């Protein structure tokens, strides 16, 4: 469970991300595709070359969805309900992958938020992405 402190930590760090979300999403994805190459099997219709426009466009969406969950941090299962149905009934991405993207998003933020990526924050971001992942996975079966 996210605590008051966690929610504050996440609201501040994500607030700094500001309007870089989209770009950080794409970077997260690129990191993901290079480090954990098995994840590319879920984007075969995607061109994965560096700086690909599909990668960018998908990052913006990922980050937009993350931004929405931050805005509704106290009602995430409802705020994310639609994404959760998509991922369970249509995309059917295996659950272990969520952890991998999460790690990459954290690397990405760490690399861009030197001052705000403190230990306490990191811990909060990590719980946060695990909550998001759990909601997106909640209807799998």
């Amino acid at each position: 469970v996210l605590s008051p402190a966690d929610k504050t930590n996440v609201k501040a760090a994500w607030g700094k991300v500001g309007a870089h979300a989209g770009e950080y999403g794409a970077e997260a994805l690129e990191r993901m595709f290079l480090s954990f190459p098995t994840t590319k099997t879920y984007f075969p219709h995607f061109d994965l070359s560096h700086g690909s426009a599909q990668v960018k466009g998908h990052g913006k969406k990922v980050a937009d969805a993350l931004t929405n969950a931050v805005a509704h941090v106290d009602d995430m299962p409802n705020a994310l309900s639609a994404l959760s149905d998509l991922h369970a009934h249509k995309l059917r991405v295996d659950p272990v992958n969520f952890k991998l993207l999460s790690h990459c998003l954290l690397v990405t933020l760490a690399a861009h938020l030197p001052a705000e990526f403190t230990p306490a924050v990191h811990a909060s971001l990590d719980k946060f992405l695990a909550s998001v992942s759990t909601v997106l996975t909640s209807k799998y079966r």
Partner: protein, 146 residues
């Protein structure tokens, strides 16, 4: 494959009693039921709405016999799993786009099914040997992914 002689021998002897046709169909069907997201690779097999629909489905049974058939030929090549399955690895990554986490799921289902069929005989030591084989087969099947 750090398999021990008595492990190698525990694996082989048991495998010689397995009805590959029945076991392969039960394995593949269970995988689709227990972890429904795996159905994403099987749209054209048809109706997969319910467990009954999945276990009765002939394409499922036939695909199952085929997968274990190849798993089976693998048990002859234990000292070299990577080599035997190399092209299988490529096809799986490059034409089929099947993530390797799937191969582990199926292995774990396979072990449940062997326990279901052989009971007392599928003892704790005999299971440990299978867990090793199934993890090796999955690793070899994934070896060519890039």
């Amino acid at each position: 494959m750090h398999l021990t002689p008595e492990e190698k021998s525990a694996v082989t002897a048991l495998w010689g009693k397995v009805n590959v046709d029945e076991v392969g169909g039960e394995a593949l069907g269970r995988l689709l039921v227990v972890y429904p997201w795996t159905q994403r690779f099987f749209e054209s097999f048809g109706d997969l709405s319910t467990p009954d629909a999945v276990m009765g489905n002939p394409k499922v049974k036939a695909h199952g016999k085929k997968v274990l058939g190849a798993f089976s030929d693998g048990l002859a090549h234990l000292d070299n799993l990577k080599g035997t399955f190399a092209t299988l690895s490529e096809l799986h990554c490059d034409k089929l786009h099947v993530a390797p986490e799937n191969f582990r799921l199926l292995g774990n289902v396979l072990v449940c099914v062997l326990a279901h069929h052989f009971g007392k005989e599928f003892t704790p030591p005999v299971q440990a040997a299978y867990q090793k084989v199934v993890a090796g087969v999955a690793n070899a099947l994934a070896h060519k992914y890039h």
